[PDB]
Amino acid sequence: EISIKIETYLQEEYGEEFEVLSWNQPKLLPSDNGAIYATCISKNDPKHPFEGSYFNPEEPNSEIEIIYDGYGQRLLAKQMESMIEEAISQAAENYYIQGDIIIPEEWQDIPVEEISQWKNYVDLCNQSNSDYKTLGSAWVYIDASTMKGKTDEEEYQMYEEVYRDKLGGQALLYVYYLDHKSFEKAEKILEIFTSGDEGSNFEDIIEGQPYFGTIMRYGSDKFDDNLEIFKAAKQGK
C-alpha cells in the first residue's frame, strides 16, 4: 500500500512516526502513473498536516521515490505558527494557526538540518531589494466568541511586532474572526487538509465571515494596511 511506503520512508528518514491521512494522484486514465500528493502528519504534531510529493514505480514491491517529502517545509511552518501563536494566544482562547511556507525546487536538495533553521531560511529568501522571496503566509482562524479582551490597538501592535521583529522578511497575515459554530466545523477540516486544499465546504463555512488580509513587504517595518483598516475589517464593512 502506498500509505505504508510513505509512512515507512518518513519514519526511517526522520526518527519520529508519521501517518498519511490521505493521498491524491491526479490522472485522467488509471494507466497514468503521475505524481502522488500525500497529506501527512507526525504523531507528535497531529493537528497540523503537511503535503509531500512522491512517485511509486510500476513493478511489484517497488521502493517509493521522493519528489519532495515536504518535511523541511513543515518544520519552517511549525516555527511560523509558533511565533504568531505568541500574539494570537493572548488575543483569543480557541484558534487554528495555519502556516503556508513553500520551498521552491531549487532549495529542495538542501539538507533538512540546514533549511529548517529559520535564520538560514530568511537568509536564503532575502537576497536584495529586487531579489526576494515571500517567507510565507499565515492563515489564522479565531473563535470570535473566545476573545481575551485585548483592545484592537493592542492586538494589532502584537501582530506588527511578530511580523517586523520575529519573522524578518516579506510575509502575509490573514486573520478570520469566525463565529463559534463556524469555527468548530472549520477546525475539524483544518486538522486533516493542508493550506489551500481544504475543499469547497470549508470555503462555504468561512465565506462572508469578517477577516483581515495584509502584507508586510520586504524592507518595510509596517503592514500595508493600517490600524483603521484592521478595525473596519474586524467588524466587516
PDB file of C-alpha atoms in Angstrom:
ATOM      1  CA  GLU A   1       0.000   0.000   0.000  1.00  0.00           C
ATOM      2  CA  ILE A   2       1.224   3.486  -0.937  1.00  0.00           C
ATOM      3  CA  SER A   3       0.479   4.958   2.503  1.00  0.00           C
ATOM      4  CA  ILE A   4       2.632   2.377   4.305  1.00  0.00           C
ATOM      5  CA  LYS A   5       5.526   3.041   1.876  1.00  0.00           C
ATOM      6  CA  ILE A   6       5.379   6.808   2.618  1.00  0.00           C
ATOM      7  CA  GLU A   7       4.947   6.284   6.394  1.00  0.00           C
ATOM      8  CA  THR A   8       7.939   3.862   6.414  1.00  0.00           C
ATOM      9  CA  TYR A   9      10.141   6.310   4.494  1.00  0.00           C
ATOM     10  CA  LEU A  10       9.335   9.324   6.751  1.00  0.00           C
ATOM     11  CA  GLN A  11       9.985   7.311   9.934  1.00  0.00           C
ATOM     12  CA  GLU A  12      13.287   5.919   8.585  1.00  0.00           C
ATOM     13  CA  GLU A  13      14.345   9.399   7.366  1.00  0.00           C
ATOM     14  CA  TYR A  14      13.410  11.454  10.496  1.00  0.00           C
ATOM     15  CA  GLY A  15      13.161   9.240  13.686  1.00  0.00           C
ATOM     16  CA  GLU A  16       9.527  10.025  14.664  1.00  0.00           C
ATOM     17  CA  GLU A  17       6.459   8.127  13.458  1.00  0.00           C
ATOM     18  CA  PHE A  18       4.033   9.597  10.916  1.00  0.00           C
ATOM     19  CA  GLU A  19       0.596   8.948   9.431  1.00  0.00           C
ATOM     20  CA  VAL A  20      -0.549   9.600   5.847  1.00  0.00           C
ATOM     21  CA  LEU A  21      -4.091  10.960   6.379  1.00  0.00           C
ATOM     22  CA  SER A  22      -4.875  10.743   2.640  1.00  0.00           C
ATOM     23  CA  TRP A  23      -3.357  10.910  -0.799  1.00  0.00           C
ATOM     24  CA  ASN A  24      -4.205  12.091  -4.189  1.00  0.00           C
ATOM     25  CA  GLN A  25      -2.939  11.054  -7.693  1.00  0.00           C
ATOM     26  CA  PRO A  26      -4.432  13.241 -10.444  1.00  0.00           C
ATOM     27  CA  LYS A  27      -4.530  11.345 -13.733  1.00  0.00           C
ATOM     28  CA  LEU A  28      -7.123  11.015 -16.468  1.00  0.00           C
ATOM     29  CA  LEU A  29      -6.546   7.229 -17.006  1.00  0.00           C
ATOM     30  CA  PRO A  30      -5.761   4.551 -14.287  1.00  0.00           C
ATOM     31  CA  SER A  31      -2.818   3.636 -16.586  1.00  0.00           C
ATOM     32  CA  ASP A  32      -1.077   7.026 -15.897  1.00  0.00           C
ATOM     33  CA  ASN A  33       1.407   6.911 -13.027  1.00  0.00           C
ATOM     34  CA  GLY A  34       1.704  10.614 -12.237  1.00  0.00           C
ATOM     35  CA  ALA A  35       2.957  12.230  -9.032  1.00  0.00           C
ATOM     36  CA  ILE A  36       1.329  11.195  -5.711  1.00  0.00           C
ATOM     37  CA  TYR A  37       0.386  14.118  -3.413  1.00  0.00           C
ATOM     38  CA  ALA A  38       0.126  12.896   0.210  1.00  0.00           C
ATOM     39  CA  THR A  39      -1.340  14.804   3.223  1.00  0.00           C
ATOM     40  CA  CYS A  40       0.821  13.697   6.170  1.00  0.00           C
ATOM     41  CA  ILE A  41       1.129  14.316   9.953  1.00  0.00           C
ATOM     42  CA  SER A  42       3.771  13.454  12.559  1.00  0.00           C
ATOM     43  CA  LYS A  43       2.179  11.705  15.591  1.00  0.00           C
ATOM     44  CA  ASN A  44       3.906  14.376  17.747  1.00  0.00           C
ATOM     45  CA  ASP A  45       2.181  17.278  15.852  1.00  0.00           C
ATOM     46  CA  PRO A  46      -1.043  15.540  14.800  1.00  0.00           C
ATOM     47  CA  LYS A  47      -3.271  18.623  14.305  1.00  0.00           C
ATOM     48  CA  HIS A  48      -1.085  20.273  11.537  1.00  0.00           C
ATOM     49  CA  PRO A  49      -0.813  18.356   8.286  1.00  0.00           C
ATOM     50  CA  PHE A  50       1.768  18.832   5.514  1.00  0.00           C
ATOM     51  CA  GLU A  51       1.919  17.817   1.845  1.00  0.00           C
ATOM     52  CA  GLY A  52       4.602  15.619   0.267  1.00  0.00           C
ATOM     53  CA  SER A  53       5.186  14.693  -3.371  1.00  0.00           C
ATOM     54  CA  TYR A  54       6.090  11.017  -4.294  1.00  0.00           C
ATOM     55  CA  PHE A  55       6.385   8.633  -7.303  1.00  0.00           C
ATOM     56  CA  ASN A  56       5.518   4.919  -6.997  1.00  0.00           C
ATOM     57  CA  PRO A  57       7.182   2.698  -9.677  1.00  0.00           C
ATOM     58  CA  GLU A  58       5.184   0.223 -11.855  1.00  0.00           C
ATOM     59  CA  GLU A  59       6.611  -3.307 -10.944  1.00  0.00           C
ATOM     60  CA  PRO A  60       5.799  -5.027  -7.536  1.00  0.00           C
ATOM     61  CA  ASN A  61       7.394  -4.325  -4.108  1.00  0.00           C
ATOM     62  CA  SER A  62       8.950  -1.135  -5.541  1.00  0.00           C
ATOM     63  CA  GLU A  63      10.617   1.288  -3.145  1.00  0.00           C
ATOM     64  CA  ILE A  64       8.813   4.634  -3.170  1.00  0.00           C
ATOM     65  CA  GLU A  65      10.677   7.573  -4.823  1.00  0.00           C
ATOM     66  CA  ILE A  66      10.625  11.078  -3.303  1.00  0.00           C
ATOM     67  CA  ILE A  67       9.923  14.143  -5.460  1.00  0.00           C
ATOM     68  CA  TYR A  68       9.876  16.322  -2.288  1.00  0.00           C
ATOM     69  CA  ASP A  69       8.768  14.945   1.145  1.00  0.00           C
ATOM     70  CA  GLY A  70       7.658  18.349   2.417  1.00  0.00           C
ATOM     71  CA  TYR A  71       9.019  17.865   5.944  1.00  0.00           C
ATOM     72  CA  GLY A  72      11.639  20.640   5.979  1.00  0.00           C
ATOM     73  CA  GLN A  73       8.875  22.887   4.753  1.00  0.00           C
ATOM     74  CA  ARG A  74       6.620  21.705   7.641  1.00  0.00           C
ATOM     75  CA  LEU A  75       9.259  22.442  10.265  1.00  0.00           C
ATOM     76  CA  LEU A  76       9.511  26.024   8.896  1.00  0.00           C
ATOM     77  CA  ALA A  77       5.653  26.306   9.059  1.00  0.00           C
ATOM     78  CA  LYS A  78       5.721  24.993  12.670  1.00  0.00           C
ATOM     79  CA  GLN A  79       8.064  27.877  13.601  1.00  0.00           C
ATOM     80  CA  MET A  80       5.958  30.494  11.761  1.00  0.00           C
ATOM     81  CA  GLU A  81       2.862  29.177  13.604  1.00  0.00           C
ATOM     82  CA  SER A  82       4.704  29.277  16.929  1.00  0.00           C
ATOM     83  CA  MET A  83       5.853  32.925  16.516  1.00  0.00           C
ATOM     84  CA  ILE A  84       2.325  34.029  15.525  1.00  0.00           C
ATOM     85  CA  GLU A  85       0.800  31.993  18.422  1.00  0.00           C
ATOM     86  CA  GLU A  86       2.803  34.131  20.904  1.00  0.00           C
ATOM     87  CA  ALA A  87       0.477  37.008  19.828  1.00  0.00           C
ATOM     88  CA  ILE A  88      -2.713  35.026  18.967  1.00  0.00           C
ATOM     89  CA  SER A  89      -2.768  33.126  22.309  1.00  0.00           C
ATOM     90  CA  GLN A  90      -3.003  36.456  24.169  1.00  0.00           C
ATOM     91  CA  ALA A  91      -5.870  37.654  21.871  1.00  0.00           C
ATOM     92  CA  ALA A  92      -8.182  34.534  21.931  1.00  0.00           C
ATOM     93  CA  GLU A  93      -8.589  31.076  23.621  1.00  0.00           C
ATOM     94  CA  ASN A  94      -9.649  28.921  20.622  1.00  0.00           C
ATOM     95  CA  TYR A  95      -7.955  29.287  17.259  1.00  0.00           C
ATOM     96  CA  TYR A  96      -6.101  27.494  14.481  1.00  0.00           C
ATOM     97  CA  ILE A  97      -2.876  28.939  13.048  1.00  0.00           C
ATOM     98  CA  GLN A  98      -2.005  27.501   9.622  1.00  0.00           C
ATOM     99  CA  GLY A  99       1.489  28.251   8.257  1.00  0.00           C
ATOM    100  CA  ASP A 100       1.824  28.282   4.441  1.00  0.00           C
ATOM    101  CA  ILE A 101       5.529  28.126   3.528  1.00  0.00           C
ATOM    102  CA  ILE A 102       6.506  26.737   0.087  1.00  0.00           C
ATOM    103  CA  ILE A 103      10.153  25.764  -0.571  1.00  0.00           C
ATOM    104  CA  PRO A 104      10.940  26.065  -4.336  1.00  0.00           C
ATOM    105  CA  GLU A 105      12.559  23.274  -6.456  1.00  0.00           C
ATOM    106  CA  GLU A 106      15.988  24.997  -6.233  1.00  0.00           C
ATOM    107  CA  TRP A 107      16.147  24.535  -2.401  1.00  0.00           C
ATOM    108  CA  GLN A 108      14.592  21.079  -2.055  1.00  0.00           C
ATOM    109  CA  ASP A 109      18.035  19.433  -2.140  1.00  0.00           C
ATOM    110  CA  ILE A 110      19.233  21.480   0.901  1.00  0.00           C
ATOM    111  CA  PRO A 111      19.561  19.206   3.996  1.00  0.00           C
ATOM    112  CA  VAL A 112      16.620  19.438   6.430  1.00  0.00           C
ATOM    113  CA  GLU A 113      19.055  20.145   9.373  1.00  0.00           C
ATOM    114  CA  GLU A 114      20.190  23.280   7.414  1.00  0.00           C
ATOM    115  CA  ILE A 115      16.964  24.606   5.773  1.00  0.00           C
ATOM    116  CA  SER A 116      14.693  24.125   8.824  1.00  0.00           C
ATOM    117  CA  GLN A 117      16.587  26.756  10.865  1.00  0.00           C
ATOM    118  CA  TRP A 118      14.573  29.976  10.461  1.00  0.00           C
ATOM    119  CA  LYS A 119      17.712  32.144  10.328  1.00  0.00           C
ATOM    120  CA  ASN A 120      19.030  30.212   7.249  1.00  0.00           C
ATOM    121  CA  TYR A 121      15.678  30.295   5.531  1.00  0.00           C
ATOM    122  CA  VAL A 122      15.418  34.097   5.952  1.00  0.00           C
ATOM    123  CA  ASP A 123      18.984  34.446   4.615  1.00  0.00           C
ATOM    124  CA  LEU A 124      18.020  32.393   1.545  1.00  0.00           C
ATOM    125  CA  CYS A 125      14.843  34.467   0.990  1.00  0.00           C
ATOM    126  CA  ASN A 126      16.356  37.935   1.471  1.00  0.00           C
ATOM    127  CA  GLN A 127      18.930  38.314  -1.382  1.00  0.00           C
ATOM    128  CA  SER A 128      18.327  42.019  -2.294  1.00  0.00           C
ATOM    129  CA  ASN A 129      15.668  44.741  -2.651  1.00  0.00           C
ATOM    130  CA  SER A 130      14.949  43.293  -6.173  1.00  0.00           C
ATOM    131  CA  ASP A 131      15.588  39.548  -5.469  1.00  0.00           C
ATOM    132  CA  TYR A 132      13.499  38.274  -2.571  1.00  0.00           C
ATOM    133  CA  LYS A 133      11.038  35.535  -1.757  1.00  0.00           C
ATOM    134  CA  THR A 134       7.884  35.836   0.315  1.00  0.00           C
ATOM    135  CA  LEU A 135       8.726  33.877   3.503  1.00  0.00           C
ATOM    136  CA  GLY A 136       5.162  32.655   3.597  1.00  0.00           C
ATOM    137  CA  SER A 137       1.592  33.304   4.600  1.00  0.00           C
ATOM    138  CA  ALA A 138      -0.231  32.638   7.871  1.00  0.00           C
ATOM    139  CA  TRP A 139      -3.932  31.685   7.787  1.00  0.00           C
ATOM    140  CA  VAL A 140      -5.221  32.310  11.290  1.00  0.00           C
ATOM    141  CA  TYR A 141      -8.781  31.201  12.188  1.00  0.00           C
ATOM    142  CA  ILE A 142     -10.092  32.605  15.538  1.00  0.00           C
ATOM    143  CA  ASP A 143     -13.208  31.614  17.534  1.00  0.00           C
ATOM    144  CA  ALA A 144     -14.570  35.151  17.960  1.00  0.00           C
ATOM    145  CA  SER A 145     -16.671  34.077  20.976  1.00  0.00           C
ATOM    146  CA  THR A 146     -13.432  33.368  22.913  1.00  0.00           C
ATOM    147  CA  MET A 147     -11.619  36.792  22.626  1.00  0.00           C
ATOM    148  CA  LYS A 148      -9.488  37.698  25.706  1.00  0.00           C
ATOM    149  CA  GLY A 149     -10.426  41.439  25.735  1.00  0.00           C
ATOM    150  CA  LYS A 150      -7.135  42.904  24.427  1.00  0.00           C
ATOM    151  CA  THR A 151      -8.032  46.191  22.625  1.00  0.00           C
ATOM    152  CA  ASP A 152      -7.859  46.340  18.810  1.00  0.00           C
ATOM    153  CA  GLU A 153      -4.739  48.590  19.138  1.00  0.00           C
ATOM    154  CA  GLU A 154      -3.032  46.068  21.488  1.00  0.00           C
ATOM    155  CA  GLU A 155      -3.937  43.172  19.171  1.00  0.00           C
ATOM    156  CA  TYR A 156      -2.657  44.910  16.003  1.00  0.00           C
ATOM    157  CA  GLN A 157       0.556  46.075  17.756  1.00  0.00           C
ATOM    158  CA  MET A 158       1.356  42.450  18.719  1.00  0.00           C
ATOM    159  CA  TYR A 159       0.944  41.258  15.114  1.00  0.00           C
ATOM    160  CA  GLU A 160       3.060  44.195  13.812  1.00  0.00           C
ATOM    161  CA  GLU A 161       5.792  43.094  16.315  1.00  0.00           C
ATOM    162  CA  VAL A 162       5.725  39.415  15.212  1.00  0.00           C
ATOM    163  CA  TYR A 163       5.939  40.351  11.504  1.00  0.00           C
ATOM    164  CA  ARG A 164       8.591  43.083  11.969  1.00  0.00           C
ATOM    165  CA  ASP A 165      10.855  41.680  14.728  1.00  0.00           C
ATOM    166  CA  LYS A 166      10.294  37.885  14.662  1.00  0.00           C
ATOM    167  CA  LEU A 167       9.662  36.850  11.011  1.00  0.00           C
ATOM    168  CA  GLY A 168      12.339  39.055   9.381  1.00  0.00           C
ATOM    169  CA  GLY A 169      11.156  39.340   5.764  1.00  0.00           C
ATOM    170  CA  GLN A 170       8.236  39.691   3.362  1.00  0.00           C
ATOM    171  CA  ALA A 171       5.200  37.805   4.786  1.00  0.00           C
ATOM    172  CA  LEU A 172       1.362  37.877   4.663  1.00  0.00           C
ATOM    173  CA  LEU A 173      -1.184  37.663   7.523  1.00  0.00           C
ATOM    174  CA  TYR A 174      -4.833  36.554   7.231  1.00  0.00           C
ATOM    175  CA  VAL A 175      -6.999  36.599  10.408  1.00  0.00           C
ATOM    176  CA  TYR A 176     -10.539  35.235  10.191  1.00  0.00           C
ATOM    177  CA  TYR A 177     -12.868  36.093  13.130  1.00  0.00           C
ATOM    178  CA  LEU A 178     -15.317  33.176  12.875  1.00  0.00           C
ATOM    179  CA  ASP A 179     -18.461  32.608  14.934  1.00  0.00           C
ATOM    180  CA  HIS A 180     -18.249  29.665  17.405  1.00  0.00           C
ATOM    181  CA  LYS A 181     -20.170  27.044  15.416  1.00  0.00           C
ATOM    182  CA  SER A 182     -18.349  28.036  12.177  1.00  0.00           C
ATOM    183  CA  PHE A 183     -15.009  27.808  13.896  1.00  0.00           C
ATOM    184  CA  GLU A 184     -15.658  24.331  15.330  1.00  0.00           C
ATOM    185  CA  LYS A 185     -16.609  22.964  11.886  1.00  0.00           C
ATOM    186  CA  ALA A 186     -13.649  24.745  10.305  1.00  0.00           C
ATOM    187  CA  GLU A 187     -11.182  23.234  12.834  1.00  0.00           C
ATOM    188  CA  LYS A 188     -12.268  19.653  12.014  1.00  0.00           C
ATOM    189  CA  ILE A 189     -11.342  20.248   8.311  1.00  0.00           C
ATOM    190  CA  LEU A 190      -8.055  22.125   9.014  1.00  0.00           C
ATOM    191  CA  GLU A 191      -6.834  19.152  11.103  1.00  0.00           C
ATOM    192  CA  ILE A 192      -6.832  16.817   8.035  1.00  0.00           C
ATOM    193  CA  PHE A 193      -6.039  19.047   4.982  1.00  0.00           C
ATOM    194  CA  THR A 194      -3.141  21.377   4.049  1.00  0.00           C
ATOM    195  CA  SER A 195      -3.310  25.083   3.205  1.00  0.00           C
ATOM    196  CA  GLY A 196      -5.500  25.733   0.170  1.00  0.00           C
ATOM    197  CA  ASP A 197      -6.574  22.034  -0.138  1.00  0.00           C
ATOM    198  CA  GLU A 198      -9.383  22.367   2.490  1.00  0.00           C
ATOM    199  CA  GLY A 199     -12.259  21.854  -0.024  1.00  0.00           C
ATOM    200  CA  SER A 200     -15.449  23.627  -1.162  1.00  0.00           C
ATOM    201  CA  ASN A 201     -17.377  23.067   2.141  1.00  0.00           C
ATOM    202  CA  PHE A 202     -14.559  24.812   4.048  1.00  0.00           C
ATOM    203  CA  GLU A 203     -14.848  27.799   1.640  1.00  0.00           C
ATOM    204  CA  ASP A 204     -18.619  27.766   2.293  1.00  0.00           C
ATOM    205  CA  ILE A 205     -18.091  27.929   6.114  1.00  0.00           C
ATOM    206  CA  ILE A 206     -15.646  30.848   6.005  1.00  0.00           C
ATOM    207  CA  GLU A 207     -17.452  32.837   3.207  1.00  0.00           C
ATOM    208  CA  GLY A 208     -18.728  36.229   4.423  1.00  0.00           C
ATOM    209  CA  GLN A 209     -17.072  35.900   7.863  1.00  0.00           C
ATOM    210  CA  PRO A 210     -15.036  39.022   8.750  1.00  0.00           C
ATOM    211  CA  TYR A 211     -11.317  38.791   8.052  1.00  0.00           C
ATOM    212  CA  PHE A 212      -8.209  40.914   7.785  1.00  0.00           C
ATOM    213  CA  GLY A 213      -5.682  40.226   4.988  1.00  0.00           C
ATOM    214  CA  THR A 214      -2.418  42.157   4.714  1.00  0.00           C
ATOM    215  CA  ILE A 215       1.254  42.003   3.877  1.00  0.00           C
ATOM    216  CA  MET A 216       4.446  43.381   5.434  1.00  0.00           C
ATOM    217  CA  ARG A 217       6.631  43.965   2.400  1.00  0.00           C
ATOM    218  CA  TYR A 218      10.319  43.435   2.021  1.00  0.00           C
ATOM    219  CA  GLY A 219      12.281  46.225   3.715  1.00  0.00           C
ATOM    220  CA  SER A 220       9.154  47.634   5.414  1.00  0.00           C
ATOM    221  CA  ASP A 221       8.586  47.779   9.200  1.00  0.00           C
ATOM    222  CA  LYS A 222       4.779  48.178   8.890  1.00  0.00           C
ATOM    223  CA  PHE A 223       1.879  46.336   7.244  1.00  0.00           C
ATOM    224  CA  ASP A 224       0.343  47.736   4.060  1.00  0.00           C
ATOM    225  CA  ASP A 225      -2.976  48.128   5.921  1.00  0.00           C
ATOM    226  CA  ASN A 226      -3.051  50.422   8.981  1.00  0.00           C
ATOM    227  CA  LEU A 227      -4.883  50.059  12.348  1.00  0.00           C
ATOM    228  CA  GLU A 228      -8.028  51.792  10.999  1.00  0.00           C
ATOM    229  CA  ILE A 229      -8.360  49.268   8.135  1.00  0.00           C
ATOM    230  CA  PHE A 230      -7.864  46.453  10.705  1.00  0.00           C
ATOM    231  CA  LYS A 231     -10.650  47.760  12.980  1.00  0.00           C
ATOM    232  CA  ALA A 232     -13.041  48.118   9.997  1.00  0.00           C
ATOM    233  CA  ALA A 233     -12.143  44.602   8.680  1.00  0.00           C
ATOM    234  CA  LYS A 234     -12.645  43.047  12.154  1.00  0.00           C
ATOM    235  CA  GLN A 235     -16.301  44.414  12.184  1.00  0.00           C
ATOM    236  CA  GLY A 236     -16.777  43.591   8.427  1.00  0.00           C
ATOM    237  CA  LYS A 237     -17.514  46.771   6.343  1.00  0.00           C
TER     238      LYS A 237
END
